[PDB]
Structure formats: structure tokens, C-alpha cells
Subunit: 312 residues, 5 copies
């Protein structure tokens, strides 16, 4: 029951790693996802061993639950994980092997700075409660690095799983060596969003620019205002896909720019009508001809500037 | 309590099968459904038997819970199933019969590539934890294949239940023989969707094509833009039935095509008005007469191409 | 603890019945409702009795929990019911009385074929697990038939509670005598729906028919298309009351007919304008005068046909 | 453990009362609210006493949990309450004092007949399970009547808490004396609703009445139909505040009247245009001048009639 | 097990404090947030000590769970907290140290009087149950004041954590010394709301004011009414960000003012048209020219008045 005594005068090291089996339910609204995987642990019990038997009497000895096992916990998942022990075995000179399958609901945030073309990083953290004087300093073994189990996440793809680092944890300067970090890097598949959220809005905006080829005030007014109403309705329609956030994003900037363009178009139409009424047709014609070219060029330049600002 | 010893030098085989009673609540948003059924198990205990009695002293002997029973689990359902044992009986030469009714919330995904005319396949998986050296390799008996209990699922129909296969499970090259697969094949009843989601959108689109029989710019502009607004409003209305997905589907392609058609109609109306203004009525009349026939033919051809692309 | 031995050579019969106290929360979206009631049971223990005492030493003897009681379960409610035993008493020649109050969340479907004027039937099912050889065949006593407790359900009314029948249950040809059926018949109060869902839609539709008294193309186009937009907006507004279903209903047929009428009105307006443009005013006037009478008559005839089709 | 024996030949009376501490979360959709309060109980143990000690050896004696305490339950709250015992003390001649703090989720319905200016009444019910022959008939003490703890409920105000009555409970003519009733009377603060739900709708309706000062058919048609669309959109916007109910309310009647007024306005505009077309301008002018005054007067009279009908 | 006896004739004082680790999920709809922190406690056990050992036999003695520890509870969080004891140690002359990490779902309300530019204050309350005669009067130590753990809350910022005060709790004049108060002061980051909720509404309102530069009745009517519809649609779009409240706020006043401005604009347009019809063009021109300047000035003055009224 008791942990191995500090005979080696060196903290016990526990090599550990996880192996993914199936992950799913990565919703953007609650920043939650489910992970099912297999967790393995190793030991540094080489100086001594409670069962150092090496003869053929007990080949591949397996220990019961009475032997000591480390207790680890995930600091992100709410409630507690469900683990079922499946394999315990002790080799000569200690170094027992302990495998199990678990399930948890990790809590990791997302950064929607580049929502359609963003890359996220899901984090996994675990710690071990120290006992007596010797520490339980953890390490990582690259043989059981994980993944490689044909696991697929819909709407995303996986490029790496561990990139193992050991950041120094800090909690009121507690007596903890470090905390293990597991960073699942993913990328979004953005092709489906182009015909669904991007192109219809551009088509609606381009429809409103046909008012520069007409001289009817009523038709121009109807076109511009009804196009604004249609844009607002489309924004209501696709409000679920767009992320509600307390900071500034790319799509929000695009939408604000579209609103500004609608306002400027209304102003231009009113100015043209007023100039035509006061018997100055040449000025109105010149202004309309200039705007015909000015509007798309300014739109493209502003889009390029935003793309260079929002993506480095 | 202990499993039968390996006397036959052959892994114990457990014939098993399930019999549906009632299934319901197949919602498309969460990809969840509830299953209540009866699970039966058989044994290969023919080499020996803990109760091999064959005389008339104990006719149709029934075993208590102290005897060993296999432990199986469903890898898809969250939490755990609720099972109530209803019948245990031991025959001569072993071969005990063990029946129960259970309930679970299986987790199976859906593929909405052909949402209105799609066919799904719900999956059931179970495994058995091996004990000692002999394996618990599973099999299937066609006598208890299941279904045939007048079970009905609303909005769908059932064509098959098992199509029994035994895929070789893989989890870090573990020592598991295989995993049982149960595939419930279903098909959707698509008749109700035609008057509810399909025909109104086509009527709205066809309303906008009447602008090719008129020469009033204001009336044409009002017709086309208000029809676009009505289309967006209808899309908002039926957004619950249409499935939100991260890939490309059939209805999404149709909707994008409808948006493109609206844009082209606006462009054509503007071009006709501009040509009429510049004192070229013959060209405008010819363009309108050509478009009157061109638009429906192109729509039909594109629909045929999409139907051949999205259905093989 | 053990059930009465089969001394009478006849299966033990358990007379049973429930008495409603309060039912509520009948939501149409989840097809769920809550029932609180009192359940009573009787016995056929007349051949013998474990406590057949008839003297005045123990007047109105009450048994403890050690005596055997039948175990029943509801096959519709998820999880389990909460029951608190309140009265146990044994009379001469057996025939004990056992009363309790329970609570459950029954699962019963609804058929929205005639949603505004429909009549539903909530179902309650229970079974008893047989022990030994004698059966526990159930029956019903009309004295405790139930209801009659001033219980009111909002939005509905109650006309009957039991209509006691005993359908022969079937589950893989199991050894079960039958299953008790309790059918709570209810009817909906439809008066509130007429001024809320029906009349506004008819008013909107009738507004669009005023275009047959005008000769202005722009006014007619604006009227019809804006009325279509208003109809779609109203349908969005009342989408919660209308039931989402995978089959064909009455309101859905009415809405599809309204869409068809809008399309035909647009076609008629376009035809009239085209005929007037080509210097044929008499034909346009005759067509408009004919349509003025044709539209309401056809609407009424189609409504009558639908009412005779959807209600026998 | 056993209750006091019937020595006085009179049922034991338990004086009881509750003292509010904090109440919150009064949502209109689920008709649920949370109550945290302190519950006190008294006894009629004056004929005898299990601990009738009156000397100075044990001043202010406090009893352990082994002594008998009444068991009460709330018939409205689902699941069960959470109670923590904080004070037990026995005085000379019995009359023990028992205080605790509890929490529950009471289930009380609401009547939205006068939704903006309504007064509700939350109900609390509790009963005691009788033991042996003597009854546990309950009473009320006005000293601990409750409230008076600076408790505030947002959106409402409190005018009374108890108005203590003892209705005679009825459940299959059971042997229960009565049931305690606690009626928390509240009133809604209606000032915030006037600028939020009432005034904008009236402004929208009044906008549509400007069509009686114009002679342009197209402008009148646009005004009336677009105002109808705006009214429907506003109704969609404020659909959460308005209560969905299966009976007739005040706001529903107002909304139906507004729809009727829109229909009559459309009819009047069409009639005026038709009369003007047929070379009868005097009749159209007289009708418009009459309607200018007729519409507001009829609206006001109908509002007064509805206000007298819906409020006695 | 028993608390220290009252040897010092002075109530035992328990110095306490919390140290934040991570807080998240501050949603405005449910007024809920999650707190994970470390709680420390001190003792006044200086007069005596159950383990007053001061020799080197037991250096840094640690007590087991058998020793007495105070029991505290949070009066705001529903259900109960999850605490894991991590450190117990007894020093010479008592003064034990007891640390743990906990988690809870605190219940604190919010005041949306100045929703975009508001400052909230989350509250934490705890009490201790007194035992015997000596009190457990609590205090605060500024060394462990808390925070200072690089904790960040999205959408807000933190300026203070404790501002320690000890309000005198009142509950039916109970025997409780006081209740500890912990006030986490936060401020909202309002920059993102300006381009998302404020500027588009102002642009829509300004679009409607271009009707004062035109003399076409139909164009003015279309502009104003369609702008009103667009404003209602935008209000529907941003209804989630705006807080639903039963009192009067700043944004609600702004929206009501915008509705009033729309109504006045409609009235002005109608008056101008009526005056122009009756052959009084000079009066209409003067009224339009006056309104051109009057509308923005009145809007700005009303905004300034509201800003001075709603912010002191
Ligand atoms: C931000 C969103 C994108 C905004 C893009 C706005 C493009 C507007 C281009 C307008 C150019 C007007 C000037 C022009 O080309 O004509 C010169 C013209 C020459 O007039 P003369 O007869 O010499 O006197 O100058 C003018 O008339 C000045 C007109 C100023 C008002 C223009 C308002 C345009 C809309 C804002
Ligand atoms: C408080 C917040 C206040 C916001 C105010 C928003 C006002 C919205 C209404 C804008 C109306 C624009 C139409 C003005 C117009 O037609 O002016 C044309 C007028 C006529 O030509 P003149 O140089 O005067 O020739 C001499 C003979 N008249 O001028 C022009 O042609 C030049 C262009 C003037 C308008 C330029 C754009 C103004 C934009 C203001 C935006 C304010 C909010 C930011
Ligand atoms: C994708 C959605 C569906 C798109 C379907 C678009 C159909 C448009 C058909 C237009 C045909 C125009 C050519 C035509 O028929 O007339 C030939 C006509 C002959 O003119 P002449 O007097 O010889 O010089 O050619 C033209 O005028 C060319 C006009 C080019 C612009 C047409 C724009 C149509 C809308 C895009
Ligand atoms: C950055 C993204 C930029 C996107 C730009 C979107 C622009 C939207 C506005 C489109 C306006 C179309 C109206 C053009 C028009 O009326 O042109 C008619 C003009 C007059 O005849 P001419 O050959 O010039 O005869 C000589 C005397 N004039 O030309 C025609 O008739 C031929 C047809 C021209 C337009 C063809 C369609 C253009 C579509 C562009 C789509 C761009 C986005 C994809
Ligand atoms: C389904 C929803 C309800 C549909 C109700 C539709 C009612 C339409 C009635 C139209 C009747 C038209 C025929 C008529 O009355 O006039 C006869 C008239 C006589 O013409 P002559 O000068 O003899 O050549 O016939 C016609 O003109 C035929 C016109 C055919 C097209 C009518 C299209 C109506 C809308 C569809
Ligand atoms: C319910 C919502 C509120 C409804 C309020 C409706 C008010 C309508 C008032 C119409 C009064 C019309 C009669 C009038 O004032 O003029 C008398 C006038 C006198 O005509 P002579 O030249 O004598 O022939 O009578 C008429 O013309 C009768 C007209 C009948 C149709 C009126 C339709 C009004 C809208 C319905
Ligand atoms: C099945 C359900 C059927 C519902 C039918 C709904 C119909 C909606 C269309 C209503 C059209 C109203 C316009 C009628 C109109 O302009 O009539 C004017 C006409 C011309 O004057 P006459 O007396 O005929 O003078 C002789 C020379 N003509 O008559 C009038 O001026 C009098 C007023 C007539 C209309 C009165 C109001 C009718 C309302 C009907 C509502 C039906 C649903 C309830
Ligand atoms: C609240 C939201 C903001 C409201 C802002 C409203 C600004 C309206 C300004 C109207 C000023 C009208 C008076 C004016 O400038 O002209 C004086 C003018 C002088 O007329 P004489 O020929 O001397 O007769 O007075 C009038 O004509 C009075 C007109 C009264 C009706 C005005 C209605 C305006 C809209 C309300
Ligand atoms: C019950 C609730 C009832 C609410 C009633 C709401 C009514 C909405 C319709 C408002 C119509 C406004 C148009 C009035 C109009 O054009 O009047 C112009 C008329 C013509 O000039 P006279 O002085 O009469 O010159 C002599 C020759 N005629 O008068 C004016 O120019 C002065 C301005 C009159 C209108 C002033 C604004 C009225 C606002 C009323 C709001 C009521 C609800 C608050």
C-alpha cells in the first residue's frame, strides 16, 4: 500500500503516455469535446522491488490492487473521469506496466481570430499528488506517443498530438515539480464555408452596385434599401455559424465594412439626385461615372488591407 | 465464480444475439437513439460442466447468480446500460441460457450527403473481457437474429437488422479476437418533404422569372429584390429541417445555385434597362426573348448534372 | 418472503387499479407528461392464508414489509418510479390491501393528423414478474376505476380514464398472460387557436386578392409580393405552435394551398399586364372579372374537399 | 423513537411556521421558483413528557436525534428538499423547539389573464403522516408568521405571505385532517413594459393611418402593406415576453384587433381607389374624410370595451 | 473530535482567506460563474493545545483527520462544493495550517443599468456553525488576500478581489457574529460593442434622414418605412447581446427614442406632402429646411441628456 521507500535517494520517476482511440463532439459554442483513450504508466523501481522475483516459478507475474499505484487527475475536466483497469504486470527489477481506458470532458478554450481559416490547439493537463519526501517527477516516453489509431474528427484534421513540453506549474509557489502538457493541433476545413457564408453576401452586396447604371431615383432607393434589408436577413440566417465573441474578428470587420459601404451608397445616390434636381446634370453624371469604378477598387483595397492586418 | 478451466484446449465460444422490442427518438441534431431489446447468450461448455446432472431429480435446472456469466459492454453508449436478468437455466452437457432486457443510448453518426433521399445505418458494438488464457471468441446464431417484433420507427422504415460481420478490432495491437457488428439499415420517407421544403422554393424562384415579360424597370426591380428577400426568409423558416454540416450536400448546392440565378437575373434586368436607355430597343428585346427560354433550360440542365453528380 | 404456495391449483389473481390525483406538463414537443396517483392492489389468497387469524385479539391486523408483495413495473417511463407505501392491512381469509402514491414520466406518442381539432389517448402499461409455477394473472376492479378527483389538465379536457382492456402481450412468445392497458382519453380546446393562427392568415391572403380591382401593374406587383413576404413572416412567427412532423397534416396542406394560390395570382397579374400591353384590353378585363369570382369559389371548394378528406 | 402515547385522549397538535430568507428565479416559462427559508415546529406534549426534568441540573436541555420528530413533505416540489437541523431544545413540560433551513423548487401555476397588470399567488403545501390512533392535526402560530427579512424579488413586489387558511384536503376520502396553505401574494411592476412592448406597436399602427391624407394609390399600398410587415416583425421580436397560453388574454385580443384594423384599412384604400377610377371623386373624398375621424374613435371605443371586459 | 474547550474565556478566532486559481464561464443570462481556488484557515489555539509538543522528536508534525476542523459552507452556491484536503500541519502552540482546493457555482446577480459600460461585483459568502458556548468569530489575514495568479476572465478585467468587510448577518436575530464578504470587482471591455451594436443602428437611422433632401412622396415613404423595417430586423438580430430586464436601461431608452424619431419623420413627410398638395409650396419648403437642421440637433441634445441622466 505504501509507496516505495526512498532507498535510491532520488525522486521516483513515472514515465507516462496516452493513446487516442476516439474523439468527437467538438462544439464551438461550449468549447467542449470528448476524449476516449488508453493511458499507460511506467516506474523507476530499479533500486529495489517489493516483488523482485526472477525465477521461472511465476512467469509474467501480475500484481493485485493491493500494490501501490500513482493517483493522477485532470485539472480541466469537470466532475471526474471513468477509468477501468485492464492490465497490471510486474517485470524483473520492478518496472510494472499499468494500462486502462478512460473517458473525460476536457475544458479548452478557442480563439476565433481567423474563424474560417483558424488553427486551434486542445490542451490536456494532469498532475500527481506527492507522498512522503521523494517526488513523483513525471516524464514522457516517445514509444507510446499516441494517436496513430485512424481516429478522425469531422470538420477538422489532425497534424500532431503531443509536442511534449513540461511547463513549470505555479500555484502559490507550491511544492510541485511541473505539469505535463499535451497539445492536440487541428486545422479547419474551410472549403464548405465559401459557398455557404461568403459568396451569397458578396452577391447581395454586388446587387446593390447596379444603381450606378440607372437614373431613376425611386428604383435606386428601392434597390439599395431592400438590399440592406436582405443583408440583415442573411446575417440573421447565418448567425449560428458566426461566433459570438467579446473581441474583434475578421468576419465582424467585413460586416462592419459592408454596412459602411451601404451607407456611402445611399449618400451617393442622394447627392446625385440632389445635383440632378438643381439643373447640374454634368456634375451628377461625372460623379456617377467616377463611383462606378471607385467602389469596387476601394472594396478590394480594404479587403487586402484587412487580410494583411488579420493574418500577419 | 471462476470461468471453466481450459480442459478442451480450445477457447470458449459464446453464441449471442439480440431481439428488438422498441426503438424510438431518432433525432438528427444529436445523432442519438434509444434501443430496448432482449439479449441472449449461449455457451460452449461441452467438454465438461460444473452441473452435468442429467437425471430426473432436477428437471430443467436453473442456476443462481453464483455461477460465472460473461461480462460484455457497449463501446458506443455513454454511461452504462440498465439490465435486469429474467431467465437462467442449465441443460445437460452445459449450454446454459441467459436472457435479459436492457436499455441504452447508442452513439452513431449520420451522413447527410443525400438528406431528403438518404439511407442510414445504425451500428451496435460489444466486446467481452478475456479471462485466464482461453479466449471468449464470440459468434452469432441466426435463430435469434432479432427484429420481427412489429417494431416501427416514425419517419423511417426498416429493411434489415444484422448482416452479421465480425470486423477485426484494432487498439494498439491488443489481444482481442474481434468485435461484433450489428447494422440496422433504415430508409427515409421523403414524400412529406416535397410539398414542405421543395415546392415552395421552386414557386418563389419561378415568380421572379416573370420579369422577362415586362418592360417596367421599377416593377422588375421590385419583383426580383423582393423575391430574393422572400427566399432568404423561407430559408430562415426551414433552417431546422435542413442539416447543418461541415461538408457539401445536395440542398446546399441547390440553394447556392438559386442565389447565383438571382444575381444573374438582376444583371440581365440592369443590362436590358441600360440598353433601352441608350436607344437600342432591338438588342434589349432580343436579349429578353433569348433569356425567357435560356433561364429554365439552364436551370433544368444544372439540376440534372447535380442529380447525376450527387447520386452516382 | 416466498409467494403463497400453489395450493389451489389455480394462478393467483391480483386485482389492481389506480386513482388519479394530479397530472400536468403535457408538452407537444417531447410527448411527455407527469402523473401522480394512488395505486391499489388486491389478492386471491382465499384457499389459505399465512395470517388467517379471525379472532378479536388482533382487530384489523396490519402486516410488515416481511410479507410478500407483487413487483410491478411501467414499461413506458424511463428510469424508475418513486413509490411510498402508506397502508398495508390483512383481512380474514387473506385479501390484503396495499395502497401507495407514486410519480412517473410516461412516454406516449401523439398523432397530429387533425392538430387543432384532434383527440389523443395517453397509454399506461404495467406488468408483473411471475414466480414459481403459478401465474400472477392480473384483473381490474371497477370500484377503484380512478379519476373523479377534480383533476384538471390545462388546454384539454378529460372524457374517460380506463376503458379497461387486456391486450395479449407478445415478446418472442414469452410466458406472460397479458398486459394491462389504461387509456386516458382527452380532447383539445380549439377556440383560442381561431383568432391566433387561423384568422390572421386568412386576412393576409384576402388582402392579396384586392389586386383584381386595380389596373396599376406596379401596385399589383407590390401588393402580391409583399403579401407573400408577410405570409412567410407569419409562418415563421407561429412555427412553434404548428407541429413539426414527418407525415402529412391538415395545416400543412392549407399552407401549401396558400402558396399555390399566391403563385397563380402572380401568373394572373402578369398575364393581364401582358395582354393589356399588346393592345387587347377586352380580354384582360374579361379575365380579371372572371378571376374576381373564380378565386374565392375555388378556395372554398378546395377547403371543403380537404375538410372531407382529412376528417372522414 | 415512538411518538408520545395517547395519554391525553386528544390528537397531538403541532404548531408550525416558516420564515423566508431569500427567494429568486421566478421564470414565467416553467412556472418555477426557488425558496430558502427557516421552518419551526412546536408540540402539544403537555399531558406528559419523556424528559419532564425541571431542576437546575440540566438548564436548557437539548435532545439528540433519537427523540421522535414529525415527518412532513411538500406535495408540490419535485424530488425532495434539503434540510439541515440546526437547533433542538426541550423545555419544561415538553414543548420542544426544532428549527432548520431548507431549499426546494416549488411548482405553482400562473394565470396570465392580465399579463402586464396581473397579480399572482404562489402556493406552498405540506402534510404530516399520521402514526397510531392519535392525529397530528396542524395549526399556525402568528408570532413566526414569516417574511420580514428584507427579501426582494426582482420584477415584482410582496404584499402578504400567509393569509393562513386550512382547506380540507380530499384524496379518495382519506383519513387526513386538513392541509396547510401558504399564499405568497405578489404584484408585477408594469412601468417598464409601456415603452418596450406597448408604445412601439401603437406608433407602428398610427403610421399606417397617414394614408387617409394622401391620394396616391401606390404610396398608400406601400405604406399599409409595409406597416403590416413591420407589425409582424415586431410581434416576432417581442414573442418571448408575451406568454404562450391555451386560453384568451388581453394582449392577444389587442393584436387580433390590430390585424382586423389593417384589413379594414386595406379595404378602405381599395374602395377609395375604385371609386376614384370610375369618375366619382366626391364619394371617395367624403369616404376618406369620414374614415379620418372614424378610425381613431372606433379604436378607442374598442379599447375601452376590452378594458372593461378583461378587468371586471 | 471535540472542539478545544473554552479555557481562555474568549471565543476561538479562525483566520481565513482564499487564493484564486482559475475562474471562467461568466454568462449574463443565468448570472452564474465557476470559481476554482485554494482556501486556507488559521487557529487561535494559543492558550492550550492538544498536541503542544515542541521537541525535535516530531519535526513539522502533521495531524490526521481525527482532529477537529471547522465546517464552513457557501450560502450562494447550489448543491455543495467539492473539496480535497491537501495539507494539514500543526506548529508549536497550536496554530494549525489547513489548505485545500475547491470548486463551486456561485449565484450572484448583475445590474445592467449601464450594460455596455457597466462595472459588476461578484460576491462570495461563507459562515461557520458554532459549537458549545465559545464562538467561532472569523477574521481575515491580508498575507493570503488572494488573486495574483495571472488569472484572466475573457471579456472583462479585474481591479480588486477582497475589500474585506464583515457585515452583520441577520436571520431572525440568530446567534451569529457576522458573515464574511468577498467582492470581486470587474469591468467590461466595451470597445468591441461600438462597431457591432452601436454604429450600424446609427447608420440605419441616418439613412432615413435623407428624405429631407427629396420632393418625391413615394421615394420618401419607401425610404422611411423600409428603414423602420430594417431597424426592427437589426433589433431582432442583436436581441441576444441586449439584456432582457424588468427595469429601465440605457439601450432601451435609446431604442424607444429611435422609434419616436421614426414616427416624427413619418409625420413630417406626410405634413410636407399635404401642404404641397394644397398649393402652399413655400411653407413646405421652409418646414423641410428647418427640419434638416432640427432633427440632428434634437437627437444630439436628447443623447446628451440621457447620458447625464443614466451616469450621474
Ligand atoms: C468607404 C466606402 C467606399 C467609398 C468610395 C467613394 C467613392 C466616391 C467617388 C466620388 C468622386 C467625386 C468627384 C469626381 O469624380 O468628380 C469631381 C467633381 C468636379 O466638379 P466640378 O464641376 O469641377 O465642380 O467634384 C465634385 O463634384 C465634388 C463632389 C463631392 C461629393 C461627392 C460625394 C460622393 C459620395 C460620398
Ligand atoms: C449627430 C450626428 C449627425 C449625423 C448627420 C447625418 C446626415 C445624413 C444626411 C446626409 C445628406 C447628404 C445629402 C447632401 C446633399 O445633397 O448635398 C449636396 C450639396 C449640393 O452641392 P453644393 O456644394 O451645396 O452646391 C451649391 C448649391 N447647392 O453638396 C454637394 O454636392 C457636396 C456633397 C455634400 C455631402 C457630402 C457627404 C456628407 C456626409 C455626412 C455624414 C455625416 C455622418 C458621418
Ligand atoms: C448561370 C445562371 C443561368 C444563366 C443564363 C443566362 C442566359 C442569358 C442569355 C443571353 C443571350 C444574349 C445574346 C442574344 O441572344 O442576343 C445576341 C446579341 C446580338 O447583338 P447584335 O445586335 O448582333 O450586336 O448579342 C448581344 O447583344 C450580346 C449581349 C451580351 C450581354 C448579355 C447579358 C445577359 C445576362 C448575363
Ligand atoms: C472586386 C469584385 C468586383 C465585382 C463587380 C460587380 C459589379 C456589379 C455591377 C454589374 C453591372 C452590369 C451592368 C453593365 C451594363 O449595363 O453594361 C451594358 C453595356 C452596354 O453595351 P456596350 O457593349 O458597352 O455598347 C456600347 C455602348 N455602351 O454592355 C453590354 O450590354 C454587355 C454586357 C455587359 C455586362 C455583362 C455582365 C457583367 C457581369 C460582371 C460580374 C462581376 C462579378 C462576378
Ligand atoms: C389553383 C388556385 C386557383 C386558381 C383559379 C384560377 C381562375 C382563373 C380564371 C381565368 C378564366 C379565363 C378565361 C375567361 O374567363 O375568359 C375567356 C377568354 C376568352 O377569350 P376570347 O376573346 O374568346 O379569345 O379566354 C381567354 O382569354 C383564355 C385565357 C387563358 C389564360 C388565363 C390565365 C389565368 C390565370 C392562370
Ligand atoms: C373594425 C375596424 C374599424 C372600422 C372603421 C370603419 C370606418 C369607415 C367609415 C366609412 C363611412 C362611409 C359612409 C360615409 O361617410 O359616406 C356616406 C356615403 C354617401 O354616398 P352618396 O353619394 O349619398 O351615395 O355612403 C357611401 O358612399 C357608402 C360607402 C360604403 C362603403 C364604405 C367602405 C369603408 C371601408 C369599410
Ligand atoms: C371564402 C371567403 C371569401 C372572402 C372574400 C374576400 C374578398 C377581398 C376583396 C375585397 C375587395 C373590396 C373592393 C370592392 C370595391 O371596390 O367595390 C366598390 C363598389 C363600387 O360601388 P358600387 O356600389 O358598385 O357603385 C356602382 C358602380 N360600381 O362598391 C362600393 O363602393 C361599396 C363597398 C363594397 C365593399 C364593401 C366591403 C366588402 C368587404 C368584404 C369582406 C369579405 C371577408 C369578410
Ligand atoms: C422628437 C423627435 C425630434 C423632433 C424634431 C422636430 C423638428 C420639426 C421642426 C418643424 C418647424 C416648423 C416651423 C418652421 O420652421 O416654420 C415656421 C412656419 C411658418 O409658417 P407661416 O407661413 O408663417 O404660417 O410655421 C408653420 O408652418 C407651422 C407648421 C407646424 C407643423 C410642423 C410639423 C413638423 C413635424 C412634427
Ligand atoms: C387614440 C389615439 C389617436 C392617435 C391619432 C394618430 C393620427 C395619425 C395621423 C397623423 C396625420 C398627420 C397629418 C396631418 C396633416 O397633414 O395636417 C396638415 C394641416 C394643414 O394645414 P392647416 O393648418 O390645416 O392649413 C389650413 C388648410 N388645411 O396642418 C398643418 O400643416 C399643421 C400640422 C398638423 C399635424 C401636427 C402633428 C400631429 C401629430 C398627432 C399625433 C397624435 C398621436 C400622439
Amino acid at each position: 500500500v505504501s509507496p516505495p521507500p526512498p532507498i535510491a535517494d532520488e525522486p521516483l520517476t513515472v514515465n507516462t503516455g496516452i493513446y487516442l482511440i476516439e474523439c468527437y463532439s467538438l462544439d464551438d459554442k461550449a468549447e467542449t469535446f470528448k476524449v476516449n483513450a488508453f493511458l499507460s504508466l511506467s516506474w523507476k523501481d530499479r533500486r529495489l522491488a517489493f516483488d523482485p522475483v526472477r525465477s521461472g516459478v511465476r512467469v509474467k507475474t501480475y500484481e493485485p490492487e493491493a500494490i501501490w499505484i500513482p493517483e493522477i487527475r485532470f485539472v480541466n475536466v469537470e466532475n471526474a473521469r471513468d477509468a477501468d483497469v485492464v492490465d497490471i504486470s510486474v517485470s524483473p527489477d520492478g518496472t510494472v506496466q499499468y494500462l486502462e481506458r478512460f473517458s473525460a470532458r476536457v475544458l479548452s478554450p478557442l480563439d476565433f481570430r481567423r474563424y474560417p481559416f483558424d488553427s486551434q490547439t486542445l490542451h490536456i493537463y494532469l498532475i500527481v499528488r506527492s507522498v512522503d519526501t521523494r517526488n513523483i517527477v513525471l516524464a514522457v516516453d516517445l514509444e507510446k506517443v499516441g494517436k496513430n489509431d485512424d481516429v478522425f474528427l469531422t470538420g477538422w484534421d489532425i497534424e500532431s498530438f503531443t509536442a511534449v513540453v513540461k511547463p513549470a506549474n505555479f500555484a502559490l509557489e507550491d511544492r510541485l515539480e511541473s505539469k505535463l502538457d499535451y497539445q492536440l493541433r487541428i486545422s479547419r476545413q474551410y472549403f464548405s464555408y465559401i459557398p455557404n457564408i461568403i459568396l451569397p453576401m458578396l452577391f447581395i452586396l454586388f446587387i446593390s452596385w447596379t444603381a450606378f447604371w440607372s437614373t431613376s431615383y425611386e428604383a435606386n432607393v428601392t434597390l439599395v434599401v431592400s438590399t440592406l434589408i436582405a443583408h440583415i436577413a442573411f446575417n440573421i440566417l447565418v448567425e449560428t455559424n458566426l461566433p459570438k465573441t467579446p473581441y474583434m474578428t475578421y468576419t465582424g470587420a467585413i460586416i462592419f465594412m459592408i454596412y459602411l459601404f451601404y451607407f456611402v451608397a445611399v449618400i451617393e445616390v442622394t447627392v446625385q439626385h440632389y445635383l440632378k434636381v438643381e439643373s447640374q446634370p454634368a456634375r451628377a453624371a461625372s460623379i456617377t461615372r467616377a463611383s462606378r469604378i471607385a467602389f469596387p477598387v476601394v472594396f478590394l483595397l480594404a479587403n487586402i488591407i484587412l487580410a494583411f492586418l488579420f493574418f500577419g
